Structure 1
């Protein structure tokens, strides 16, 4: 079972300028709760985007997908394709693909679950933005209530499963 987890603005933006263009502590807490103890698979750009105290993400098996031969990622396992990341020598009951846009597009056909945070922040897309995948009719989901963060942003969590 492979799941995707991401946070997006309502407009679909997930990344800008090498980072995430809002601050939402409640989403980071949700991400920690869903992923702790499990495998997290990410593209190399997302690995390079992690803040220092989160590189590697503590308490998870970190896997980094790159085409670079010989890349060392201290605290993570380096693999050469998403398929390799999903064929571990040591199986894990739960594997989460945690971004970014390039890796989500490769992972979506292989996944059966998506956990999405929607953030009500106005971000007209800009040309180098990383965008969320769009879930088609093969997916169905459920939505939590709109909540207000302690920092003031409206947000809500959606849970999708493959039909």
Structure 2
């Protein structure tokens, strides 16, 4: 099983300026529950975005995709291709925009947090991947985050 997990604004923006323009503790807890114990695969830019104290995320095989053969991600594996990372029962791709697009052919699950923030797309933004007609979706109810933004979970799946 390869799954993708991400949070997006209603516009599809998932990242700006190398970070994320919101922070929902509830979504972080959801992310932790879904990924805990499994492989997590991330692009090098997303690894860069994690603070050194939080890196690697605990209890998970942290894998970083990079074309730099000498890139060092202390506490993580650095691989040059996505296929190298797929050696575990569950693999969660945790971003960013480039790696979501790269991993989508391998994917049968997408756990998507829609954040009710009106965030027009700007040049340089990272965006959520486009899901074609093979994906079947199940939508949760809108919830209030303590941060003040509403959010809802979509669970997309396909054979």
Fold agreement, TM-score > 0.5: yes
Distance 1:138 1:145 in 2: 23
Distance 2:80 2:109 in 1: 23
What SS does the aligned partner of 1:54 have?
coil
Distance 1:70 1:84 in 2: 16
1:52 is displaced (CA, Å) by 2.9
Instruction: Tell me whether 1:56 sits opposite 2:56 in the alignment.
Output: yes
Deviations 1:96-149 (A, max 9, x none): 000001011110011111000000011111101000001110101101100001
Distance 2:91 2:130 in 1: 20
The aligned counterpart of 1:105 is 101
Distance 1:21 1:134 in 2: 21
Distance 2:118 2:17 in 1: 16
Gaps of 5+ in 2: none
Instruction: Tell me whether 1:36 sits opposite 2:36 in the alignment.
Output: yes
1:1-163 aligned at under 5 Å gives the runs: 1-86=1-86, 88=87, 92-163=88-159
1:71 is displaced (CA, Å) by 1.4
| Aligned pairs, number | 159
Distance 2:35 2:53 in 1: 16
TM (norm. structure 1) is 0.94
Gaps of 5+ in 1: none
| RMSD of Structure 2 on Structure 1 (CA) | 1.0
TM (norm. structure 2) is 0.97
